[PDB]
């Protein structure tokens, strides 16, 4: 049945029921904490899990969620993000502020890829959604459920490319390897200033540098 | 679309580059500390041979990965620090692939280079920490669950290698529709290959997420020897620390 099991119309609705520089960020997604409650409970199955992994499931991804959200509701904007507060943080802005190469790759790696391939909210509502139903955070009463939601976002999301875009052989594929990216970029968010900032020591990859020549 | 001419081939040249550099390293373990047994729990020489052991097998296995990295179509024609930085950044979680390949149900433990299975108290007489052996190990149950097979660990090391969102890339453009060729390979292999699990493909392209996490747990492993006292030889040094 697919798409009976996940319907990606619930969660589209779920997607559109919740609609200096670090501060400002800091604050939009205080603003939009108070959300996720909301989107969750709507994304189908959720609150038919165990309440206690439905607070493990909300409380280890968070921050994932989040950034995807305001990265796709950035896709207007050129070079900047739009905070949920109405705020336009500027490429430069961030700069000045010492966040540039973390905000310079969620441009890239997320607005821009998410620019070209125009991707819809019925997909982003998914990507969310896979994100959500994470089973590998601990405490999980059982994986197994947790992993097996997951799974039916991955049919039907499919199922939906490829009837929505049926020219687009790869579509669910591209959507997929936005959460590696992803995921990356959310550990780095995470970090404390002192590993966060800690600028290294431009490298000199002399030994690897080598061996490929060799 | 099914598999194409073009794409069976690629496919076995990898599966065809793996055993070729799994043999040229095959001969290095000639080369390679000796793993100690010794009864004494923790001495000093032994957790420095233990600790030597497992480095080596990381160098060896740095080769058997740089090797790789040439025999897949396109690698080879990027610039060289563009090659430099998806193999800096992508040894690790080859590395954890390379592993769970290699895990045993069981016996749960994984052996390294044709011999000698290791656990995880073995990988923590080695140095490893627990928040990282654990996490490794359940990594590995999970990729043993897929039963793949050789190919399929081919397929999903070279789309790992290129992560055109690694840092320092500079034609992202290049290493993404380059990446776009195995993943697209992968698919129709699978599809294929393991008909009637349609998730399998899913399911693969997610540990691909996995690996970023395991890879920032490692990298809190080696800062955590900034207080251990304990070297890593310069080359793992090179790729990691900085
Ligand atoms: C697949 O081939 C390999 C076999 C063993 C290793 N060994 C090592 C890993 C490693 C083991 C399993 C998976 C990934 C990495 C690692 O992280 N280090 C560095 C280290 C050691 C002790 C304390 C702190 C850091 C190794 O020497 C590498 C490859
Ligand atoms: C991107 C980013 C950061 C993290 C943001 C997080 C974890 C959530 C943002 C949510 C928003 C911005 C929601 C919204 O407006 O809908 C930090 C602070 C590390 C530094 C600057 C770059």
Redesign the pocket.
């Given at each position: 049945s697919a798409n009976e099991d996940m319907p990606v119309e619930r969660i589209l609705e779920a997607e559109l029921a919740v609609e200096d520089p670090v501060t400002n960020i800091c604050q939009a997604a205080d603003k939009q904490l108070f959300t996720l409650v909301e989107w969750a409970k709507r994304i189908p199955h959720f609150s038919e899990l165990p309440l206690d992994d439905q607070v493990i499931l909300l409380r280890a991804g968070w921050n994932e969620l989040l950034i995807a959200s305001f990265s796709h509701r950035s896709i207007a904007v050129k070079d900047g993000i739009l905070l949920a507060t109405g705020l336009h943080v500027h490429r430069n802005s961030a700069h000045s502020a010492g966040v540039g190469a973390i905000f310079d790759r969620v441009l890239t790696e997320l607005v821009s890829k998410m620019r070209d391939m125009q991707m819809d909210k019925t997909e982003l509502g998914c990507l969310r959604a896979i994100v959500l139903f994470n089973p590998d955070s601990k405490g999980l009463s059982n994986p197994a459920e947790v992993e097996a939601l997951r799974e039916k976002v991955y049919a039907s999301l499919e199922a939906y490319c490829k009837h929505k875009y049926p020219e687009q052989p790869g579509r669910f594929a591209k959507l997929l390897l936005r959460l590696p990216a992803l995921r990356s970029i959310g550990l780095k968010c995470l970090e404390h200033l002192f590993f966060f900032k800690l600028i290294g020591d431009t490298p000199i990859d002399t030994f690897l540098m080598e061996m490929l020549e060799a | 679309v099914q598999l194409s001419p073009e794409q069976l081939g690629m496919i076995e040249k990898l599966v065809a580059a793996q055993q070729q550099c799994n043999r040229r390293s095959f001969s290095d373990r000639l080369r390679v500390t000796p793993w100690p047994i010794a009864p004494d729990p923790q001495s000093r020489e032994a957790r420095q041979q233990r600790?030597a052991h497992?480095?080596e097998?990381?160098i060896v296995?740095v080769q058997e990965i740089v090797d790789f990295a040439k025999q897949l179509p396109g690698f080879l024609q990027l610039s060289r620090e563009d090659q430099i930085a998806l193999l800096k950044t992508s040894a690790?979680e080859v590395?954890?692939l390379?592993?769970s390949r290699?895990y045993n149900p069981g016996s749960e433990s994984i052996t390294?280079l044709k011999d000698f299975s290791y656990n995880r108290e073995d990988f923590a007489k080695?140095?490893?920490q627990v928040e990282?052996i654990n996490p490794?190990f359940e990594f590995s149950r999970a990729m043993n669950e897929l039963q793949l097979n050789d190919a399929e660990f081919a397929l999903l090391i070279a789309i790992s290698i290129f992560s055109a969102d690694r840092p320092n890339v500079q034609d992202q453009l290049q290493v993404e529709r380059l990446q776009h060729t195995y993943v697209e390979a992968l698919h129709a292999y699978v599809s294929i290959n393991h008909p009637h699990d349609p998730l399998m493909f899913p399911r693969m392209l997610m540990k691909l997420v996995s690996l970023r996490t395991l890879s920032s747990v490692?990298s809190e492993?080696?800062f955590?020897?900034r207080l251990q006292d304990?070297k890593?030889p310069p080359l793992?040094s090179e790729i990691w620390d900085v």
């Open positions: - | 600790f497992f480095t097998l990381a296995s690790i590395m954890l390379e592993t290699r390294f080695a140095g490893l990282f490794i490692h492993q080696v955590a020897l304990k890593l793992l």
